[PDB]
Amino acid sequence: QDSLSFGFPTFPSDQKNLIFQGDAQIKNNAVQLTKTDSNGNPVASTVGRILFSAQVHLWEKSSSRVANFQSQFSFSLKSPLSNGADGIAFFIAPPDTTIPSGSGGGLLGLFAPGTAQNTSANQVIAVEFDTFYAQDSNTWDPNYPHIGIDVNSIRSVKTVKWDRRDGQSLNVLVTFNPSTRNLDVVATYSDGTRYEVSYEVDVRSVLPEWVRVGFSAASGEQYQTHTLESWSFTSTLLYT
Amino acid sequence: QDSLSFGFPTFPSDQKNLIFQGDAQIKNNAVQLTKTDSNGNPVASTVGRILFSAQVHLWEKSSSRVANFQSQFSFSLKSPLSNGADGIAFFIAPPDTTIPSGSGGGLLGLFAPGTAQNTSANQVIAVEFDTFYAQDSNTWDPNYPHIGIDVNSIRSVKTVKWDRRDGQSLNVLVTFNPSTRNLDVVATYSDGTRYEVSYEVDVRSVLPEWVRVGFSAASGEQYQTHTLESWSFTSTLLYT
Numbered sequence A, B: 001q002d003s004l005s006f007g008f009p010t011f012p013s014d015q016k017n018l019i020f021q022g023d024a025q026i027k028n029n030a031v032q033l034t035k036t037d038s039n040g041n042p043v044a045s046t047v048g049r050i051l052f053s054a055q056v057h058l059w060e061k062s063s064s065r066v067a068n069f070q071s072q073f074s075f076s077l078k079s080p081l082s083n084g085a086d087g088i089a090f091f092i093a094p095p096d097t098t099i100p101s102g103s104g105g106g107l108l109g110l111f112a113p114g115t116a117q118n119t120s121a122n123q124v125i126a127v128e129f130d131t132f133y134a135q136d137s138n139t140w141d142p143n144y145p146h147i148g149i150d151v152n153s154i155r156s157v158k159t160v161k162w163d164r165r166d167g168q169s170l171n172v173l174v175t176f177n178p179s180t181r182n183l184d185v186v187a188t189y190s191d192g193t194r195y196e197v198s199y200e201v202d203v204r205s206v207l208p209e210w211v212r213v214g215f216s217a218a219s220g221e222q223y224q225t226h227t228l229e230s231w232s233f234t235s236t237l238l239y240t
């Protein structure tokens, strides 16, 4: 289970409970979601994701209960260029989820090209930190960097303008209150700059009772490192 | 991960994070470690165990840290016989642990006959609630029902007299403080009757850095049900 929590203050190399997909790997006590060359620089055309191995019981039909959850994490993006792409996302999906074919670049390794904007064809909730919005390839993005809440589509149901800071860690807190059904996102840089965005969502109609949680990131022709530095998570089934 | 925690107030039939071994299965929101017929009656010659799927980081060689953990659980034993057997145990072992060949009866599904008392051929720490002590078969046991702390051997490093109460739930709290290296056990029946037993053990010299936790139970010629009713576990790495 009714409750589950875990915390990674750092990411040592001897991991046992993480499912690594794509190019994701541990380097310097942090998770490098996207590939990097020998000297630690970001490269183009790369996708990577990680999921915690234990499944989370998001909701239970028999007891009519729904879980609340809180995911706290920090990441940093770095790039030689100034148009780093494509972004990192915290997501929740069915337990057997895998990188969809052709989900690189602006699809963040979460959606397939042909069904990226088809809500009845996906089962995923993600909080994206999108740094690339060129209208030729990312036709669905607002015209500026942003934090978005994605519900079964790459076209966010709600966004807030965000600023990308090269090499600076962003502290994020994602919370889902089953009582109000609000998914709240609070992100802050160390100097106090704060960004907030929320949306009301009934998780029971979007995801199965048991899911897995993790992160995804990608770089198409434009690139940047997507470094996940720490992550804590907790969920508890509740009667509302 | 550095910290992991989970709680099972009850055990619904739909489980995803438990590894079932032997005859263990879910029945009536509880785990029946040993096999029962269609009427829910215990039968002879049965062994079963469960383990949480996520591995627990018990200690870390590189940082000189050892986990502080707590396992709270409750179980009940029932049998029409005057000498129900054989007992249930909470245990900690390497991740790939499986039921040893020929470990039934008094071996509780934790040790192989040929090496049951060879502390050098085993890697396990368990807290047993032993109800069968026939001196002609369980030669290693004291002559009475008991709670025991097992360290790489079926011959407990320590035991205390315990009363078996048919059909009554026993609540148990097992904790380990890495500072004092004390493994404490406190068990209580609903009327306030209490049993305590403690032992100093350096887990680092007994178990690998990553382990799995769970329960094991068995019945030889004599039988009884071994029902795990609830279980919550928490673990956190600390400096020592």
Ligand SMILES: CC(=O)N[C@@H]1[C@@H](O)[C@H](O[C@@H]2O[C@H](CO[C@H]3O[C@H](CO)[C@@H](O)[C@H](O)[C@@H]3O[C@@H]3O[C@H](CO)[C@@H](O)[C@H](O)[C@H]3NC(C)=O)[C@@H](O)[C@H](O[C@H]3O[C@H](CO)[C@@H](O)[C@H](O)[C@@H]3O[C@@H]3O[C@H](CO)[C@@H](O[C@@H]4O[C@H](CO)[C@H](O)[C@H](O)[C@H]4O)[C@H](O)[C@H]3NC(C)=O)[C@@H]2O)[C@@H](CO)O[C@@H]1O
Pocket (backbone or CB within 6 Å): B045, B081, B082, B083, B085, B086, B102, B103, B104, B105, B106, B107, B113, B132, B134, B135, B136, B137, B138, B219, B220, B221, B222, B223
């Ligand atoms: C290798 C070797 O040398 N072996 C034997 C010893 O085993 C033997 O001792 C006897 O062993 C019996 C079998 O042991 C198995 O079961 C027990 C209990 O579950 C386990 O603890 C053992 O580890 C072992 O378990 C596993 O069994 C499976 C399957 O059989 C096997 O595959 C596994 O390999 C095995 N595991 C291992 C590690 O070996 C044991 O049952 C005997 O215990 C009885 O007898 C002693 C005295 O001799 C007594 O103190 C006990 O309480 C028990 O008493 C009997 O209890 C039953 C149940 O109540 C009675 O039957 C009931 O009686 C009432 C009347 O009152 C009615 O009639 C009911 O209908 C009826 O059910 C029965 O009457 C009791 N019998 C007696 C004599 O009192 C014992 O320890 C020794 C000596 O025989 O020889 C070898 O060393």
Ligand SMILES: OC[C@H]1O[C@H](O[C@@H]2[C@H](O)[C@@H](O)O[C@H](CO)[C@H]2O)[C@@H](O)[C@@H](O)[C@@H]1O
Pocket (backbone or CB within 6 Å): A085, A086, A104, A105, A106, A107, A132, A134, A136, A137, A138, A219, A220, A221, A222, A223
């Ligand atoms: O990684 C950024 C982006 O790269 C790819 O699209 C390209 C960009 O829009 C830009 O470089 O212009 C190119 C030419 O029009 C275009 O290919 C894709 O991989 C895209 O998904 C990704 O977001």
Ligand SMILES: *[C@@H]1O[C@H](CO)[C@@H](O)[C@H](O)[C@H]1NC(C)=O
Pocket (backbone or CB within 6 Å): B115, B118, B120, B121
């Ligand atoms: C103890 O177990 C080890 C490893 O299995 C074995 O090599 C050794 O012979 C055993 N010692 C005794 C005294 O049985």
Ligand SMILES: [Ca+2]
Pocket (backbone or CB within 6 Å): A086, A106, A130, A131, A132, A133, A138, A141
């Ligand atoms: Ca984009």
Ligand SMILES: [Ca+2]
Pocket (backbone or CB within 6 Å): B086, B087, B106, B130, B131, B132, B133, B138, B141
């Ligand atoms: Ca015994």
Ligand SMILES: [Mn+2]
Pocket (backbone or CB within 6 Å): A128, A130, A140, A141, A142, A146, A148, A154, A156
């Ligand atoms: Mn976007």
Ligand SMILES: [Mn+2]
Pocket (backbone or CB within 6 Å): B128, B130, B141, B142, B146, B148, B154, B156
């Ligand atoms: Mn014993």
